[PDB]
């Protein structure tokens, strides 16, 4: 039975990096050539493996980030997305694939539905997802649920706009992590 990669890649709606989606691909056969030979990808970075196997489980994590932020979807990277949104491990065996989504995820006036965490006290551990909407305490006084000075909402929108520069344009990113699944 073929692996359901189309569902992840051709999904109508992707998710915010803060709440990235994970699809477990198990008990299936997969041709990775079709994906590589699509030619629709800006980034096809594979770490620990060549273009060419067999793995216990395959995970397909998917989200939307800016183009200037795809660099952070790699092992050993630092930044707001890597540190506080999605982290790839230093020991990473897998492939990171990406494409521009301006036509789909950008709206005149801006798309305020894709959010990110700008505020977190600590860097995220690998493959951790924080979906907390708690108000951040940037100072001594406890925030107590009220936004204000030193009391701020941790999640912010990208406001993707079609006139945005490509680096600030939305990119759809699928991370294939290799941990039932074999090539043809």
């Amino acid at each position: 039975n073929l692996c359901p990669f189309g569902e992840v890649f051709n999904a109508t709606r992707f998710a915010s990096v803060y709440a990235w989606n994970r699809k477990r691909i198990s008990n299936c056969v997969a041709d990775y050539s079709v994906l590589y030979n699509s030619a629709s990808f800006s980034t096809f970075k594979c770490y620990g493996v060549s273009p060419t196997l067999c793995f216990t489980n395959v995970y397909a994590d998917s989200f939307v980030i800016r183009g200037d932020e795809v660099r952070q979807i790699a092992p050993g990277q630092t930044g707001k997305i890597a540190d506080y949104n999605y982290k790839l491990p230093d020991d990473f065996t897998g492939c990171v694939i990406a494409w521009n989504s301006n036509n789909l995820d950008s709206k005149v006036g801006g798309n305020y539905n894709y959010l990110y965490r700008l505020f977190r006290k600590s860097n995220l551990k690998p493959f951790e997802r924080d979906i907390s909407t708690e108000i951040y305490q940037a100072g001594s006084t406890p925030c107590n649920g009220v936004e204000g000075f030193n009391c701020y909402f941790p999640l912010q929108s990208y406001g993707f706009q079609p006139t945005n520069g490509v680096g600030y344009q939305p990119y759809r990113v699928v991370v294939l992590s290799f941990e039932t699944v074999c090539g043809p």
Partner: antibody
Amino acid sequence: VQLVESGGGLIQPGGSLRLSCAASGITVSSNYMTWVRQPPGKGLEWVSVIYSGGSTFYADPVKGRFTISRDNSRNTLYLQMNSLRAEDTAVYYCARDLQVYGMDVWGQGTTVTVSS
Amino acid sequence: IQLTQSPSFLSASVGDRVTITCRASQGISNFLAWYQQKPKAPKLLIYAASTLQGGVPSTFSGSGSGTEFTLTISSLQPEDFATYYCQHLNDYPLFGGGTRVEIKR
């Protein structure tokens, strides 16, 4: 409330100086903390930033020469400037960068002069 | 990646309307801030192109999205005479050349 800067002085090319920013009303560790410089008569330029999680980023001109640091106990931010050059002469400002809400709290400034 | 603040020097009188323009090389949406420096620490006036920081007088306004942004003072007042800087809000912060508002004579 207040960000207080200290440490500026006269130094010669190749020298090292450390600047201090003491904070009240904000927590240096809990916030993105930045260093911005105004070369004399030339306007504002970014130098470095420390993130809440420890990630440090630096401007290409000061990349191998400067280090941003913090002490949570003293609520103090630091910039260690080494291999100093004349072009590094400026008033050095410390700020708290709420990134999408702007750099709201700024320090008074400390002047660094590098001359032979 | 390139921000140009157009009126480097502006001359005006109290009660006048002053418009300062910041242009970006590429579209940056609403990611810009406006700052005032008297000769002493920059002060934040506007964040997100149009949002006033607290305490800033209503005479101060921000407009713009994409490539062109403008700061407008409805009536210049004595303390408003100063230098104004536009900043791009990005992981790598960029400031504009600056605009000096001077008394007309």
